[PDB]
Amino acid sequence: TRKFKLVLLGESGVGKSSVVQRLMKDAFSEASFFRYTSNVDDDTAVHFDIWDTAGLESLASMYYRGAAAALVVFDIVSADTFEKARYWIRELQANSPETVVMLVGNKKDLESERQVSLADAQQSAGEMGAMYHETSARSGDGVRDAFHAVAAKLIE
Ligand SMILES: Nc1nc2c(ncn2[C@@H]2O[C@H](COP(=O)(O)OP(=O)(O)O)[C@@H](O)[C@H]2O)c(=O)[nH]1
Numbered sequence: 298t299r300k301f302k303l304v305l306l307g308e309s310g311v312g313k314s315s316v317v318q319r320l321m322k323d324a325f326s327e328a329s330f331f332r333y334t335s336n337v338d339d340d341t342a343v344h345f346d347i348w349d350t351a352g353l354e355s356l357a358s359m360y361y362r363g364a365a366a367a368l369v370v371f372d373i374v375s376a377d378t379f380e381k382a383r384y385w386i387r388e389l390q391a392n393s394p395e396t397v398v399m400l401v402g403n404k405k406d407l408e409s410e411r412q413v414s415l416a417d418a419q420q421s422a423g424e425m426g427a428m429y430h431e432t433s434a435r436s437g438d439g440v441r442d443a444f445h446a447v448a449a450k451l452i453e
């Protein structure tokens with residue numbers, strides 16, 4: 298069964314580890330690595346090997362090597378993490394061109410503390426040829442939706 302490597306990048310504390318834990322928790326209710334199947338439709342299922350990271354050394358090379366997709370998470374309440382995420386996208390686009398990139402707007406549960414416009418963020422992602430999605434890893438809002446999307450894209 299083909300496994301698609303999917304990696305998590307972004308600043309520390311943006312919620313990478315929590316995003317995936319949430320993914321796994323909700324799926325059971327039917328570095329580190331997590332096996333997860335996104336049922337795209339009733340006909341197609343994508344087998345993801347999700348990787349989650351601890352630092353940035355080069356081990357980075359291995360981390361991203363060969364990845365089919367990547368989620369570059371920022372924190373909606375730290376635009377500092379937003380601008381950092383753009384860096385990560387150029388890293389990938391350059392050294393790992395075949396990888397599908399989705400920029401991920403996490404902590405969406407903090408509506409009122411937000412510092413990064415949703416609009417501004419969708420715009421940058423399109424400008425950079427990346428997908429966008431926002432998620433709340435505590436509510437699990439948008440989490441499954443994000444992985445389903447990337448999987449759609451990779452089928453396509
Ligand atoms: N409010 C809120 N906090 C979150 C969310 N996801 C993660 N956090 C918190 O952000 C911190 C960092 O989470 P972690 O997964 O360790 O981030 P990582 O370092 O990027 O992997 C923790 O205190 C989490 O509870 C979210 O969706 N909403």
Ligand SMILES: [Mg+2]
Pocket residue numbers: 310313314315350
């Ligand atoms: Mg982490």
